[PDB]
Amino acid sequence: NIGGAGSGRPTYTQPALPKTPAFQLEGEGERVLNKKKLDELVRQVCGGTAEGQDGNMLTPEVEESVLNMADA
Amino acid sequence: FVDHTIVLEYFQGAYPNFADFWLFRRRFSYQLAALTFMTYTMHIDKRYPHKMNIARGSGNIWGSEAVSY
Amino acid sequence: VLMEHALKMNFDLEIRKRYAQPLAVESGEFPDTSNIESRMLPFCYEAGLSSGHAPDAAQFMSIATETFIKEVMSAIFSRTR
Amino acid sequence: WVALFPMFWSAVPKEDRPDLERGLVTLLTKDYHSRQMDKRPNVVQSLMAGAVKTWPHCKIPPHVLKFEAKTYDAWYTALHQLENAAIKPEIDSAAVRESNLDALVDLYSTLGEDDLFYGTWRRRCQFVETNAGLSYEQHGMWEKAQRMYESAQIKARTGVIPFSEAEYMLWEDHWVLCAQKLQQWEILQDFAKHENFQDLLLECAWRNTEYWQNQENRDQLDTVIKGVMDAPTPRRYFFQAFMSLLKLHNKQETPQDFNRVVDEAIQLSIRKWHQLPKRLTAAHVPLLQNFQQLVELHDASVICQSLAQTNASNLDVKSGELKLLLGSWRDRLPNMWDDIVAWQDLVTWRQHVFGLINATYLQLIPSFAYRGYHETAWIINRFAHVARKHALPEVCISQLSRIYTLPNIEIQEAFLKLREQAKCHYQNPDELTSGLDVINNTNLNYFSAPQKAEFYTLKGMFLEKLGQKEEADTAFGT
Amino acid sequence: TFDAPPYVITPEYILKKFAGHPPSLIVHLYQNHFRFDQQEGMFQYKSPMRIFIEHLRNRTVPHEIMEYLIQGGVPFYEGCLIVQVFDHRTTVPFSIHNHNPYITPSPYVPYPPTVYTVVLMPTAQALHTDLLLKTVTPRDHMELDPKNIYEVEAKILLATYPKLDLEPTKNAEETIAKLEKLAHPEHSHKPPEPKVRDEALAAEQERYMLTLDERLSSKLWEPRFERFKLIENIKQEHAEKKEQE
Known part of the structure; x- marks a missing residue:
């Protein structure tokens, strides 16, 4: 979709074969995968985590520092 | 006896x-509009x-x- | 420095979109291909690259960011465990 | 298949239907179906019809239907479910209803159904100014619609009453459309330049005849045209073809490439015509106008080639040859009730071609070489008459007044000017000053008896309103 | 010479001394937005203007909008501000069967504030911003060359604090007593707290039904009227230009 006017506008208005948008029928969702990414990295570089515990590998004050690092 | 979904069901x-x-x-909508105007302005009575x-x-x-009344 | 601290294409309407997307710290989501792709264009327009960027740059940038974070975290862990 | 599918779907246990529905949605959007676009009985139509024949127990998202119908010619199958779900929604939720109505309105807009579009939008709005503006735009009163939209936006600025985003986008889009219909191009050009709208910028630039003469200006426009060509469409291809014609006129290209461009445009137009319903609907008219445009484009290319090649030896005999083709062109016009934009485009294209002819013939003289001005005057007068019949305020007057300055006073141009002057009597209230000034003195009446006689009759009828019974009596008696 | 403020500034003294003068600002609070008296638009509590609400809660001058305030000539009282607060805070949508006097009936329905006044205290950031703005404001040319910034600030500080406590003590107890006596209300807070971190079927059904929706899918909104204002500006410019011709 080129032109810059925008798409999905319900107002008064084309290529021969437009491209289908992206969709996901059912699954975990990005809102979960993105949040789990950091814990996944910590698990990767920490060597391994024993059964019955995971996720809480960085204290609340260190996750903010890591995110700032990434953005910068 | 008579509900409001008879003619729609038939057609x-x-x-x-x-x-x-x-x-x-x-087409039916436009034709009904024309007939309504004709009948309203000329005072046709027994419809x-x-x-x-x-x-x-x-x-x-x-x-x-x-026929006008 | 003090001022900062105090036909044709309008190149200044696409640079301003840089601030629309929340930062990683603001949301809590580790940056991914989508966020980096959104962030790429304003920088290119600022520097004068009218054409844009190569199609396969977002994945490269995401991989580089992941590698950098992994290296830093590995460095911190080795000296205290 | 359409007979079988409901019977077998009725045998699926109720607890398992969602899996089959998701699998069906996945199967409908596959990528290998594109090898079946042209075959008329194809699997997409059959699957959609089978699903929709049992709608209450087989739910499909509205937008999947909307997306597939536009490409695989299943318009009415989609509309069936789309406008049956508005009466009796499947699920109780505001978001579902909003999405369904959005899809329905989009289909109505694409198919060219104006009245259903406005009727559907007027039962969905929240303000009263939006309602009034839609009802005014339905009856072709553009100024009032613009004013109501502006008032609606101003009132909404306060924020005391909440509104939605659909209305917010509608106000802007329809303000732009109403401005387009009223020939407010001067401000639209700058608005598009500021807002980065390429197509609107091209449409605005195409209306400036002289802008396309400077080499640098056309070089700049070429970049925009090439930028918007990764998603070819009939209008973009027309613009590319016009650019190629202009390039050819200046000995910068071979005719073969121009013919290739025209062939590509024709193929795209045919491919888009094949995707609409079989029986002639209201969405077919623009494509017919496009066919005429392409034919006239080729004719103008031949005109330019012959003109250049024959004038290369300074042979002022091809005026008669051009006369036949101009006369043939003089009978190809739209119908009086066609959209105004069609007349605008026709006039603009003819003006471009006539300007080309005038430019080529002006450098040679320093009567027979002043035909472009006559043709431009004739087409302007015809468009002015049509615009008056459309009840466009000041558009007819604007066109009749923009022709004040035109050189090469000739019998044809003088007669056209006299016809325009006779057309100045609109028979409208509060226009007494202009009529009285015209009565005072206006050119000469020695040209022809019928013209002066009709002028006298118009003067008498103008006097009749003022109450000058005997004056008008004597005037039209004479 | 100008009268200098006391050691501790309180709302009572400032309100009493300047009573009968126009308030510096007027703010109206609604359920989910606020605005100024002459303002026509609105601000959301979630928008970037939450800083003003935070400052109002904390009673601090909002140094971030100092230049905007200076443009409007807002009045200052001994470097503080007085703000007036007005508290206004205290069918079947998207259905085609709803009735409205401007719509047909449709055959699927039977038939058709508290007022407050507060004072905001100044800070060091405010003075820093004031000097920084004065440095870059053309009037020599500029209104203040940098090299005189230190002398100007020295004179301003001398004016603000005319009297200081310069009496030596003699032992630890006297110093402790003096420290206790001189405590400040604004610098006597406490240390902060450590930082801390059936319907599913219906939600799934709604998400499924909203498939392939270009705009509504993502959400499952702060209007600014930028296009309208641009159109108004361009129309005004074109009309003004046409005035000459």
Whole structure:
């Protein structure tokens, strides 16, 4: 979709074969995968985590520092 | 006795293909508007239900026995 | 420095979109291909690259960011465990 | 298949239907179906019809239907479910209803159904100014619609009453459309330039005849045209073809490439015509106008080639040859009730071609070489008459007044000017000053008896309103 | 010479001394937005203007909008501000069967504030911003060359604090007593707290039904009227230009 006017506008208005948008029928969702990414990295570089515990590998004050690092 | 979904049921069952029903209804609306104007301005009086003819072939409407009162 | 601290294409309407997307710290989501792709264009327009960027740059940038974070975290862990 | 599918779907246990529905949605959007676009009985139509024949127990998202119908010619199958779900929604939720109505309105807009579009939008709005503006735009009163939209936006600025985003986008889009219909191009050009709208910028620039003469200006426009060509469409291809014609006129290209461009445009137009319903609907008219445009484009290319090649030897005999083709062109016009934009485009294209002819013939003289001005005057007068019949305020007057300055006073141009002057009598209230000034003195009446006689009759009828019974009596008696 | 403020500034003294003068600002609070008296638009509590609400809660001058305030000539009282607060805070949508006097009936329905006044105290950031703005404001040319910034600030500080406590003590107890006596209300807070971190079927059904929706899918909104204002500006410019011709 080129032109810059925008798409999905319900107002008064084309290529021969437009491209289908992206969709996901059912699954975990990005809102979960993105949040789990950091814990996944910590698990990767920490060597391994024993059964019955995971996720809480960085204290609340260190996750903010890591995110700032990434953005910068 | 009489609900409000009789004529719609009849004309939905008369047209197996939906394109035909869509076009029929689209023409029927305009024809009814024209007939309404004609009947309203000239003071036609006894508009019994057997005086409205509907052409199933296209959608035209002809109101027979139209005489001013 | 003090001022900062105090036909044709309008190149200044696409640079301003840089601030629309929330930062990683603001949301809590580790940056991914989508966020980096959104962030790429304003920088290119600022520097004068009218054409844009190559199609396969977002994945490269995401991989580089992941590698950098992994290296830093590995460095911190080795000296205290 | 359409007979079988409901019977077998009725045998699926109720607890398992969602899995089959998701699998069906996945199967409908596959990528290998594109090898079946042209075959008329194809699997997409059959699957959609089978699903929709049992709608209450087989739910499909509205937008999947909307997306597939536009490409695989299943318009009415989609509309069936789309406008049956508005009467009796499947699920109780505001978001579902909003999405369904959005899809329905988009289909109505694409198919060219104006009245259903406005009727559907007027039962969905929240303000009263939006309602009034839609009802005014339905009846072709653009100024009032613009004013109501502006008032609606101003009132909404306060924020005391909440509104939605659909209305917010509608106000802007329809303000732009109403401005387009009223020939407010001067401000639209700058608005598009500021807002980065390429197509609107091209449309605005195409209306400036002289802008396309400077080499640098056309070089700049070429970049925009090439930028918007990764998603070819009939209008973009027309613009590319016009650019190629202009390039050819200046000995910068071979005719073969121009013919290739025209062939590509024709193929795209045919491919887009093949995707609409079989029976002639209201969405076919623009494509017919496009066909005429392409034919006239080729004719103008031949005109330019012959003109250049014959004038290369300074042979002022091809005026008669051009006369036949101009006369043939003089009978190809739209119908009086066609959209105004069609007349605008026709006039603009003819003006471009006539300007080309005038430019080529002006450098040679320093009567027979002043035909472009006559043709431009004729087409302007015809468009002015049509615009008056459309009840466009000041558009007819604007066109009749923008022709004040035109050189090469000739019998044809003088007669056209006299016809325009006779057309100045609109028979409208509060226009007494202009009529009285015209009565005072206006050119000469020695040209022809019928013209002066009709002028006298118009003067008498103008006097009749003022109450000058005997004056008008004597005037039209004479 | 100008009268200098006391050691501790309180709302009572400032309100009493300047009573009968126009308030510096007027703010109206609604359920989910606020605005100024002459303002026509609105601000959301979630928008970037939450800083003003935070400052109002904390009673601090909002140094971030100092230049905007200076443009409007807002009045200052001994470097503080007085703000007036007005508290206004205290069918079947998207259905085609709803009735409205401007719509047909449709055959699927039977038939058709508290007022407050507060004072905001100044800070060091405010003075820093004031000097920084004065440095870059053309009037020599500029209104203040940098090299005189230190002398100007020295004179301003001398004016603000005319009297200081310069009496030596003699032992620890006297110093402790003096420290206790001189405590400040604004610098006597406490240390902060450590930082801390059936319907599913219906939600799934709604998400499924909203498939392939270009705009509504993502959400499952702060209007600014920028296009309208641009159109108004361009129309005004074109009309003004046409005035000459």
